[PDB]
Amino acid sequence: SPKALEEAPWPPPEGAFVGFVLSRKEPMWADLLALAAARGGRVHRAPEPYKALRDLKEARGLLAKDLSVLALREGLGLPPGDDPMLLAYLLDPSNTTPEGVARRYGGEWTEEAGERAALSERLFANLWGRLEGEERLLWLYREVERPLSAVLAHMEATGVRLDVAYLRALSLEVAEEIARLEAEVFRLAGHPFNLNSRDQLERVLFDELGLPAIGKTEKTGKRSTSAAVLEALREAHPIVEKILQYRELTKLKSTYIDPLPDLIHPRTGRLHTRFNQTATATGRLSSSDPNLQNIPVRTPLGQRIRRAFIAEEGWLLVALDYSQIELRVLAHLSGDENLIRVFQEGRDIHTETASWMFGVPREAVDPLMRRAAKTINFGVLYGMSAHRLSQELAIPYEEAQAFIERYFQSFPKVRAWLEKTLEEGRRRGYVETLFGRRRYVPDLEARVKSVREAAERMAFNMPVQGTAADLMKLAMVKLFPRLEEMGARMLLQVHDELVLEAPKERAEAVARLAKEVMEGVYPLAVPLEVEVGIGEDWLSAK
DNA sequence: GACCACGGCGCC
DNA sequence: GGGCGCCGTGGTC
Ligand SMILES: Nc1ccn([C@H]2CC[C@@H](COP(=O)(O)OP(=O)(O)OP(=O)(O)O)O2)c(=O)n1
Ligand SMILES: [Mg+2]
Ligand SMILES: [Mn+2]
Ligand SMILES: [Mn+2]
Ligand SMILES: [Mn+2]
Ligand SMILES: [Mn+2]
Ligand SMILES: [Mn+2]
Ligand SMILES: [Mn+2]
């Protein structure tokens, strides 16, 4: 039999599938080691990869977005196009890696660019075939995921400005506060130990100081030293508050204050995350290297850190955040008339819960009190126990149970939608979003109750979180070209929030426009309301 | 140096 | 409660 794949000289014809090898996975930081392309039955290998990038009109193939990011870094406008990872991810969002997708759908992810190109081509063919007749998944691919990949490449290449000297100064200040706390912890324990070691702390708290253990850890069943356990022990011994404070500051310093300034890119002078498009079971994006979707916001030090994310000189940040997003989406999905009415009347369920929680009038609820109510409202919605709710609010168990009962009694059709969702997931093997994005949940049939019930909580959540994800993605695709036209920049997505950068002279017009695009994206049974703020830094913009 | 699993915890 | 990614530790190679 004749050979299946022939080598031919660079450059490839238009429409070819690319393969490429990076020195490291992060495209803003990677050296392009090899580039190749495949089409029909030929493979073309680039003599010198960087120069050869200039020969391509489009990056089509596995991880197309990442090659596009690298090209943009080098000042080339090479947009991403088809990518089999996106097809695979829509078929089953457990398809998250090229290694796994290759094995499942047609071969092997190797370390050679030509092989990667040929792999890209055959995977695309095979996965296109698998989507035959999947009209809703195809619509998601063509209208959302494929165009979104080009938006994400542009965002990644743009980056965000960081106040490096501010964070360097903050490190020195927090180091002194950490030393005070750790020293006090050791004074109170009677000796030093590694306070970063939860194993060493466990022995200190429960074996040496004789404090009561409250909870156990999941995989190894050690006595937990989690914040929930420490909070329960706060009045038992003065060491506990000191450990909580030490943990707060060390978490911020080790995760954000110290690492972020070291990640400023030498070419751009900015901070560049990865927006991972095939990483979550629900259709959300993720952000990594560094994660810019978990920048602190709740504590005073945390807020200091958020102040380091700044606009370029002469620009402003614009932050837009969907109000009460998953409660609105749930209203639509469930058709609950009471929940629909809440939003028709302009009510805020987080503010109402905060009022009850803190025992103050709604007018007296401040933003951090309202924020605290989110874990309560979403926790309860998605199945939090009365035991946990009682601990979290320091109320009697019976009062926590009453809250839970009243919450679902208020929105009677939510329970009906839960049962419909679970039956469908049992029968089909998967649950789905409004747009038809699917998540397979085989443990809905598990015979171990704890395993099955966990699966049920995963399954009930997915259509709500995932529909919210679908809406935000669609909004990004519609908004991006509007911003390009106005000389504004899309910088960050944070699940139901976008952070943009706009010249000062155009910032108010950009904010107004972006708000309207987001609110009007895909109308539901309730209004989608967007909160918008403008500022020189991310804290000020919210 | 690197890997991972884990506990833990930051955000949505 | 659900969804993530990164930290340091500990064990390991
Ligand atoms: N503890 C949380 C916080 C958030 N989310 C999910 C549901 C809401 C969504 C977006 O987060 P927020 O913007 O913080 O929530 P919101 O209800 O949209 O609040 P806001 O009106 O302040 O934007 O992420 C969740 O499941 N659990
Ligand atoms: Mg938000
Ligand atoms: Mn590799
Ligand atoms: Mn400024
Ligand atoms: Mn929101
Ligand atoms: Mn459906
Ligand atoms: Mn741009
Ligand atoms: Mn984990």
Structure tokens at A241: 């508050």
> CA separation (Å) from A133 to A92, A125, A128, A136, A138?
16, 15, 10, 9, 8
φ, ψ dihedrals at A439, nearest 5°: -130, 125
Based on the number of CB atoms within 10 Å of its own CB, is A521 exposed (0-12), middle (13-18) or buried (19 or more)?
A: buried
Nearest in space to A232 (alpha carbons), one of A392, A29, A66, A446: A392
Structure tokens at A340: 């629909």
Structure tokens at A481: 């070209």
User: Nearest protein residue to C1's C1' (by CA)?
Assistant: A379
Residue A227 contacts strand B, CB under 7 A: yes
What kind of experiment solved this structure? X-ray
The ligand 1 atom at the shortest distance from the C-alpha of residue A324 is: 17
Euclidean distance between CA atoms A87 and A100, whole angstroms: 13
Residue A234: DSSP 8-state = T
Three-state secondary structure readout of A352-420: HHHHHHHCCCHHHCCHHHHHHHHHHHHHHHCCCCHHHHHHHHCCCHHHHHHHHHHHHHHCHHHHHHHHH
Q: Is A461 in the pocket of ligand 1 (CB under 6 A)?
A: no
Contacts of A211 (CB under 8 A, 6+ apart): A205, A233, A236, A237, A240
- Which nucleotide shows the minimum CA-to-C1' distance to residue A248? B9
Is the Cβ–Cβ distance between A288 and A521 less than 8 Å?
no
The amino acid sitting at A302 is G
Q: Is A375 in the pocket of ligand 1 (CB under 6 A)?
A: yes
Task: Tell me the HSE value of A18 on the side-chain side, using a 13 A CA sphere.
Answer: 33
Euclidean distance between CA atoms A115 and A252, whole angstroms: 43
Is the Cβ–Cβ distance between A34 and A112 less than 8 Å?
yes
Nearest in space to A67 (alpha carbons), one of A14, A100, A30, A121: A30
Residue A235: DSSP 8-state = T
Buried b (16+ CB within 10 A) or exposed e, A269-296: ebbbbbbbbbbbbbbbbbbebbebbebb
Euclidean distance between CA atoms A198 and A101, whole angstroms: 37
CB atoms within 10 A of CB A297: 15
Buried b (16+ CB within 10 A) or exposed e, A110-124: eeebbbbbbbbbbbb
Nearest in space to A40 (alpha carbons), one of A69, A64, A74, A17: A17
Location of structure tokens 């901070």? A271
DSSP string, A209-227: S-PPP--B-TTT-PBP--H
Nearest in space to A87 (alpha carbons), one of A137, A41, A155, A34: A137
Find the A98 Cα to ligand 3 centroid distance in Å: 10
Nearest in space to A137 (alpha carbons), one of A95, A177, A180: A95
Give the domains, in start order, of chain A with CATH numbers: 1-157 (3.30.420.10), 158-274 (1.20.1060.10), 275-324+469-542 (3.30.70.370), 325-468 (no CATH)
| Sign of torsion over alpha carbons A212, A218, A222, A224 | negative
Residue A444: DSSP 8-state = G
Structure tokens at A287: 């952000």
Euclidean distance between CA atoms A491 and A214, whole angstroms: 43
Which ligand approaches the C-alpha of residue A498 most closely?
2
The helix, strand and coil proportions of chain A, stated in percent and rounded to the nearest 5, come to 55, 15, 35
Give the Cα-Cα-Cα angle A184, A187, A190 (nearest 5 degrees).
Answer: 150
Euclidean distance between CA atoms A408 and A334, whole angstroms: 12
Q: Is A371 in the pocket of ligand 1 (CB under 6 A)?
A: no
Location of structure tokens 């996975």? A25
Task: Tell me the HSE value of A303 on the side-chain side, using a 13 A CA sphere.
Answer: 9
Instruction: Decide the pairing of beta strands A315-322 and A42-45.
Output: unpaired
Is the Cβ–Cβ distance between A353 and A377 less than 8 Å?
yes
Task: Tell me the HSE value of A37 on the side-chain side, using a 13 A CA sphere.
Answer: 24
Is the Cβ–Cβ distance between A67 and A80 less than 8 Å?
yes
Instruction: Decide the pairing of beta strands A497-503 and A315-322.
Output: antiparallel
Q: Is A66 in the pocket of ligand 1 (CB under 6 A)?
A: no
Location of structure tokens 């629909």? A340
φ, ψ dihedrals at A42, nearest 5°: -115, 155
Residue A527: DSSP 8-state = P
Nearest in space to A29 (alpha carbons), one of A262, A292, A257, A256: A262
Longest Cα–Cα distance of chain A, Å, equals 81
Residue A497 contacts strand B, CB under 7 A: yes
In angstroms, this model's resolution equals: 1.7
CB atoms within 10 A of CB A247: 18
Instruction: Decide the pairing of beta strands A309-310 and A161-162.
Output: antiparallel
Is the Cβ–Cβ distance between A419 and A382 less than 8 Å?
no
Is the Cβ–Cβ distance between A275 and A156 less than 8 Å?
yes
Residue A322: DSSP 8-state = E
Which ligand approaches the C-alpha of residue A217 most closely?
8
Q: Using alpha carbons only, how large is chain A's radius of gyration in Å?
A: 26
Residue A296 contacts strand B, CB under 7 A: yes
Which ligand approaches the C-alpha of residue A501 most closely?
7
Q: Is A326 in the pocket of ligand 1 (CB under 6 A)?
A: yes
Three-state secondary structure readout of A21-84: EECCCCCCCCCEEEEEEEECCEEEECCCHHHHHCCCCCECCCCHHHHHHHHHHCCCCCCECCCH
Count of residues in chain A: 542
Residue A537: DSSP 8-state = B
Structure tokens at A334: 């469930």
Identify the three-state secondary structure at position A493.
strand
Identify the three-state secondary structure at position A503.
strand
Q: Is A245 in the pocket of ligand 1 (CB under 6 A)?
A: no
Is the Cβ–Cβ distance between A380 and A389 less than 8 Å?
yes
- Which nucleotide shows the minimum CA-to-C1' distance to residue A219? B6
Residue A344 contacts strand C, CB under 7 A: no
